[PDB]
Enzyme design. Structure first.
Site, short mmCIF file in Angstrom:
data_model
loop_
_atom_site.label_atom_id
_atom_site.label_comp_id
_atom_site.label_asym_id
_atom_site.label_seq_id
_atom_site.Cartn_x
_atom_site.Cartn_y
_atom_site.Cartn_z
N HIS A 20 3.92 -11.16 -7.19
CA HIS A 20 3.19 -9.90 -7.28
C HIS A 20 3.25 -9.32 -8.69
CE1 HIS A 20 0.92 -7.02 -5.08
NE2 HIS A 20 1.70 -6.01 -5.43
N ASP A 47 9.86 0.53 -5.11
CA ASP A 47 8.41 0.53 -5.26
C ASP A 47 7.96 1.48 -6.35
OD1 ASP A 47 5.45 1.08 -4.56
OD2 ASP A 47 6.02 -0.47 -3.11
C1 HEM Z 1 0.44 -4.82 -0.34
C2 HEM Z 1 1.05 -3.69 -0.66
C3 HEM Z 1 1.83 -3.59 -1.91
C4 HEM Z 1 3.17 -3.48 -2.01
C5 HEM Z 1 4.13 -3.44 -0.86
C6 HEM Z 1 3.49 -3.41 -3.38
C7 HEM Z 1 4.80 -3.30 -3.83
C8 HEM Z 1 5.12 -3.54 -5.15
C9 HEM Z 1 6.42 -3.75 -5.63
C10 HEM Z 1 7.66 -3.75 -4.79
C11 HEM Z 1 6.33 -3.94 -6.97
C12 HEM Z 1 7.48 -4.21 -7.89
C13 HEM Z 1 8.15 -2.91 -8.34
C14 HEM Z 1 7.23 -2.20 -9.29
O1 HEM Z 1 7.06 -2.68 -10.43
O2 HEM Z 1 6.38 -1.42 -8.83
C15 HEM Z 1 4.97 -3.85 -7.33
C16 HEM Z 1 4.48 -3.99 -8.60
C17 HEM Z 1 3.16 -3.69 -8.90
N1 HEM Z 1 2.16 -3.43 -8.05
FE1 HEM Z 1 2.29 -3.41 -6.20
N2 HEM Z 1 2.37 -3.46 -4.10
C18 HEM Z 1 1.32 -3.58 -3.29
C19 HEM Z 1 -0.03 -3.68 -3.60
C20 HEM Z 1 -0.52 -3.46 -4.87
C21 HEM Z 1 -1.86 -3.33 -5.20
C22 HEM Z 1 -2.94 -3.44 -4.15
C23 HEM Z 1 -1.92 -3.11 -6.57
C24 HEM Z 1 -3.06 -2.90 -7.48
C25 HEM Z 1 -4.29 -3.38 -7.33
C26 HEM Z 1 -0.59 -3.11 -7.04
C27 HEM Z 1 -0.21 -2.91 -8.34
C28 HEM Z 1 1.07 -3.20 -8.78
C29 HEM Z 1 1.38 -3.30 -10.20
C30 HEM Z 1 0.38 -3.09 -11.31
C31 HEM Z 1 2.68 -3.62 -10.28
C32 HEM Z 1 3.53 -3.82 -11.52
C33 HEM Z 1 3.24 -5.08 -12.32
C34 HEM Z 1 4.00 -4.92 -13.61
O3 HEM Z 1 5.19 -4.55 -13.55
O4 HEM Z 1 3.38 -4.72 -14.67
N3 HEM Z 1 0.23 -3.32 -5.98
N4 HEM Z 1 4.25 -3.61 -6.20
#
Ligand code: HEM
Ligand code: HEM
Ligand code: HEM
Ligand code: HEM
Ligand code: HEM
Lengths: 309, 309, 309, 309, 309
Positions: D218, D145
């Site tokens: 996501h 994460d």
């Molecule tokens: C529901 C709960 C959430 C979980 C469990 C979660 C988990 C993750 C995971 C595992 C990744 C891929 C690894 C990484 O690149 O971080 C990710 C990517 C990301 N998450 Fe989340 N996330 C959640 C909610 C959110 C929310 C609410 C936002 C923003 C409004 C967000 C923003 C991002 C962004 C911007 C990325 C990366 C996209 C890219 O690589 O450019 N996430 N998230």
């Protein structure tokens, strides 16, 4: 040859205590998971083996009469609720105790996640605490906690049962007591008053002088002398927990002993008190919330359980 | 009183395996260096004693008949080459095995540098692998490797010889097998197919259900039941190695056991297979390159070698 | 059942040696503090229990005849001042020795702060050294120090007294010798000359060849052969100290042994020397300043002291 | 010259998130404690300065109109509750956010203990989570994460406000969202299906191929392209929490950004979704429980608050 | 472009302070070693670069008029001996100060060993202290020491000289004061009295309330307000030292500042005191033994010294 459960382990920075009661008619479901526990420990904690993930499975009296046939541990009984003069030590129903300890919170959390879902639907988790650890092993009172646990021979004869009960050679008895002591009166209390409460100092944890230490102090009442002259010691892994959203600041007391008569005499020296000193000074601030008496078997006993009655 | 070699040690982040064959007529040159090995270990590894440099000297059958007089270990024989139905387990000539393990690569490298140049010109190093260690003790397959090694009593009776051979009380038998499994077919294979291969999960390494686990899985075939009901376990320090310049991705299997009948029955459950399941599913991807059967003596046996015949 | 004092401990990065002489008529004041020492150790070192604070209380001959009644250790005597041919090994008066060791300087300092002020006014501290530890366990000479201490069985029979004196089963004898070797002549000396001095190499600490190693080397003179063929080993926690404001660069030698005849024969091989080699080559540079022979009792002996005569 | 709050910090193994709402008429009580926060941080976290205790004070819209006079942050508004097609993103009232992060749980707990009792009676803590951290920075879903947080220039222009609002040069906007995703459907889901959910792999966290990655993933929906071609990134310290006694397994999402339009467009890409893909695949399993939009000021802004209106 | 000396470094667990006076007519000998100091630091501390060996060369007034030609630092003068009402702050002659700091004692000891023997015979070491570090950065008084040092911009403008003296842009002024405070009266003093002495708490180091904190407290007298309203802060690396063989328990105060007027006004608030409070409460227990005012140059200034007059 009887390998005991890992009770003789140092205090770990994170701990999870789980008091789960077994639902009615779900005996064989827990009988499946009870040999699987050491397998799950070796499975999960081998990821970072320098975290020392160690579970301590414990079984109460009701779960013993339900789950196991054959013999019974000699002093295994439900936890005697101590209704003292002012402070009461209650006993909530809890069948089995899962005591988990490791260097970090996550591997204890994952072992507990795999523990209830190896017996899914068979148990309800009555008590859920995530015991963390303060700066230099302190508790929320501010005093360094657990500095008088023995080591070596004076610890294995303090905890492990020999052949005074040869059917359970190796194995302990557990007294959990989830305290929820207030900090509003304790913080306004001055430090030397608190050293009269504890019996040792606060910053450096030097034990006080024998004449200076009052009779109703914690370290004064909890020391037990026998008639031959030897003192009986227990090993306690007391880990503080708490939730500031409810304002809770508690220390999850958990004491392992060779026989529950020793721990119960310590609790009688605290709640019932001495006939001179009928109250322990830490019980002015600490109120017990939960309570339970359990039994650690050997890991061989979980490997070879007696057949289900 | 017989002090065993440090086989009962945790898995270290770096390891060096040396299979060196002894040249003809160079017996007394190795007979000089064989008492010097523990001296070199205590000499080098005391620089940073919190690196836990530990050598495991092992001697094959040919080096036993050449180097040592007097008795012989009862089951010490050349490694039986297993020519199965499809997968073959070869046996290259190797006289002695140097198993080195510590927290870092450099002190293992320096101990190996001083090892062959304490017997300079007497040996040719046949097999040279620098086994490193993955994230949470994984191998190149991606699964966590070696999580079912026993501990304590179930480990010392699994490895150390008692007085069933009293002339070698304490001491093990070693099966090295340098695998070179391909990753092109393994990576294109899906995860749940790989969990049918292994028998446990990949991310969290939970063992699968007994009905869900197939009969030709690795964890299904390698557990050995006896007729009394006890299971025979070995201790394996499998360390991955590899060279991307050749595209090599291998796991240096090395298994320590009380008797080579147990390890050979595991290899018969893998290559020859069960009479129901004649192939182990990991051998579809893993092809053994080397092989050898060795003997760990005690460190007292290296301190007091029998006279050179 | 006799628990020994923690002498069988690894070398720690910081150490404090205290040689305090007891004032006249202050016997019962030290008799108060002598059972309190293990309590102070468990009190202070439990703050960061991964620092391994371990005190080694030692008692000389004068403090034994003053403090304790009943029996006497068989070979306990004042340290025989070795007036050799050129180098002299003096013996300053010192009643008791406090040997403190832990992972950091502060907890040793605080244990020593609480040690003399548990017996305030009863003692004068004759010798005050704060022994730190070099890079890879080296000393100020530049050689890795203490790499030939035994482990396990060859260490417990090297240090702990069995029932050859059954009234003190468990317990050692201590030879402290505060050296103050000059660095002006040692630094101008070349490396290979220094390897003739020591007997091992300097960078990698390989022991030299038996024909290459001279007879007057340190490692040549200090190994002691018996007539049966076994060698007698001691365990030494030699920690370097020093003050550059006086230009002092010394190594506080401290040797624990089962009997002082072994340590005294090593000192006779050094100062008096062999009848072939009458001088040890390190004594050309190292001049002893202090000296003392002490006795470690068991921790049970401090818990249950014999009554004060 | 404007020193920002420590948002540009690495992910810590323990974290405490506090969403406390301010009681009516208790404005000056919080106005006392708001300059005291950095003093409390430097006071507590200097005990073990290698734990990196760092508080992030955040203030919502209501607490801004109550507590502060003068200007207002340009896009500071109450968190717009996203009532999508199937998944709803609620917004509980919360005035201020205390984001605490350090190497261990205890110093965060003690900073939070001193935080509410510096303003005792002025606040009620609405949301109390103790966010711990999984093995290799994973969450409860099993995926690593937060691996796409920027560093250096691409992070300070991603979070810190320049002179597009010169009265608040330096400072971020926070979107907390306490999720409570179920594990019963997620664990029964297969791994490649979960990689369609996330968009990256699970074990090694390689990003998938651009054609292989689905549009409703996501990592597919959360990357935002502008019309000039640059991508807008936020920094999120998502820490998992959970209580097994309720069966809760949640990931406390918290996102810091230069402007809430970016985070709100990410939330619109998740809940409202793309006009092609109207649902994000992780929202099939994750249901938001809480929500709030806050503002980080500078630490100079807490040092020099504007006068209380 | 002027690189300052490493004064902006965290507090290290070990430190060596060396106040060496230069002998008469040995100017060019120190002029040789003064460019060699950073070379010796990079030479020694690169062995274990995760020990952070950092020397701070400082030069007094006499060594400036002897060693260097050209300009002079504007406020560089001999340390004004403060003969207050009761407590006196003496000033022993010391030409140069060598402030050494790293993670362990040995590398500081070896850097100091190579420092005086790069200028052998040119200096006599007047003051030799080996400053170790207590549990959570405490001192011997028991209070956590140095928790109000600034960071970042409020530290570089607190220590480094800008172009108010452009010939020495970058560089500080040092006030060493070796205290030798007694513990006999301090230990018998009660805790809350000691919190009146310090001005903060003892266990958790919370600063006291502004009305509760007395006017003659240490934290009350040492904070300096200007007339514009900004406060002037210094950075102090106060390390405790001590010798129990003399019963010495001292805290080697050393304060780095942009101008010595700030440190001297702090010393005037302590010894001379306020016109209301003419004594600082810690000076009732702490008596200064040594004293000196020095100047840190840049490391470029040691790289390019002005020519020897
Ligand atoms: C529901 C709960 C959430 C979980 C469990 C979660 C988990 C993750 C995971 C595992 C990744 C891929 C690894 C990484 O690149 O971080 C990710 C990517 C990301 N998450 Fe989340 N996330 C959640 C909610 C959110 C929310 C609410 C936002 C923003 C409004 C967000 C923003 C991002 C962004 C911007 C990325 C990366 C996209 C890219 O690589 O450019 N996430 N998230
Ligand atoms: C109310 C919650 C409790 C707290 C906060 C607490 C805390 C402490 C502390 C700070 C000490 C002194 C340091 C050390 O020696 O461990 C101590 C001593 C001890 N506590 Fe507790 N304790 C609690 C309850 C109990 C209970 C319920 C028992 C057993 C029935 C117990 C058994 C002991 C014993 C045996 C000692 C040591 C006495 C001696 O040194 O021999 N404690 N406790
Ligand atoms: C081809 C290379 C091999 C690889 C990559 C490999 C890897 C693994 C893995 C991932 C496991 C499951 C985790 C654990 O329990 O250790 C396992 C189990 C095991 N392996 Fe291997 N292994 C290999 C060859 C062998 C060989 C040649 C032997 C012995 C003859 C062996 C003996 C075992 C045993 C005994 C188990 C555990 C079965 C049980 O849990 O009781 N392995 N191996
Ligand atoms: C003058 C100060 C001394 C220094 C600097 C010193 C240093 C060393 C060094 C560097 C070694 C080789 C590495 C190792 O094997 O430990 C060594 C070996 C040894 N030293 Fe010392 N030593 C000193 C005095 C003594 C004394 C006074 C004794 C005992 C009476 C002693 C007993 C030994 C023994 C027994 C060995 C090992 C011989 C063998 O390997 O069997 N040393 N010493
Ligand atoms: C007598 C030996 C001294 C001891 C044991 C000592 C110890 C302490 C302690 C425990 C504190 C409170 C914790 C912290 O804020 O640092 C403190 C504060 C301070 N000390 Fe010292 N100190 C001593 C002498 C000095 C001297 C000689 C100076 C400067 C001339 C000085 C400057 C300061 C300053 C500036 C503060 C912080 C005031 C504020 O927070 O703004 N100290 N000292």
């Amino acid at each position: 040859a009887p390998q005991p459960q890992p009770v003789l382990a140092p205090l770990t920075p994170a701990a999870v205590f789980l008091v789960a009661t077994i639902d009615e008619g779900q005996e064989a479901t827990v009988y499946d998971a009870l040999p699987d526990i050491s397998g799950l420990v070796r499975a999960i904690g081998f990821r970072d083996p320098a975290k020392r993930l160690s579970a301590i499975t414990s079984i109460g009296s009701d779960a013993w009469d339900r789950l196991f046939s054959g013999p019974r541990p000699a002093e295994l009984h439900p936890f005697r609720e101590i209704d003292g003069g002012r402070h009461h030590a209650p006993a909530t129903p809890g069948d089995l105790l899962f005591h988990l300890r490791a260097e970090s919170m996550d591997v204890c959390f994952e072992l507990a996640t795999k523990l209830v879902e190896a017996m899914s639907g068979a148990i309800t988790i009555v008590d859920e605490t995530h015991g963390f650890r303060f700066f230099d092993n302190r508790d929320l009172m501010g005093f360094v906690d657990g500095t008088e646990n023995p080591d070596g021979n004076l610890a294995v004869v303090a905890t492990q049962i020999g052949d005074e009960d040869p059917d359970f050679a190796g194995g302990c008895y557990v007294h959990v007591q989830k305290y929820l002591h207030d900090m509003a009166s304790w913080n306004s209390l001055s430090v030397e008053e608190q050293e009269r409460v504890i019996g040792r100092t606060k910053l450096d944890d030097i034990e006080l002088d024998d004449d200076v230490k009052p009779a109703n102090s914690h370290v004064a009442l909890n020391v037990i002398e026998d008639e031959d002259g030897n003192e009986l010691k227990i090993i306690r892994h007391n880990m503080p927990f708490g939730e500031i959203g409810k304002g809770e600041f508690g220390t999850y007391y958990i004491g392992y002993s060779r026989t529950p008569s020793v721990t119960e005499r310590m609790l009688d020296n605290m709640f019932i008190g001495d006939p001179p000193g009928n109250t322990d000074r830490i019980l002015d601030f600490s109120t017990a919330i939960t309570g339970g008496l359990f039994f650690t078997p050997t890991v061989d006993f979980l490997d070879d359980p007696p057949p289900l009655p």
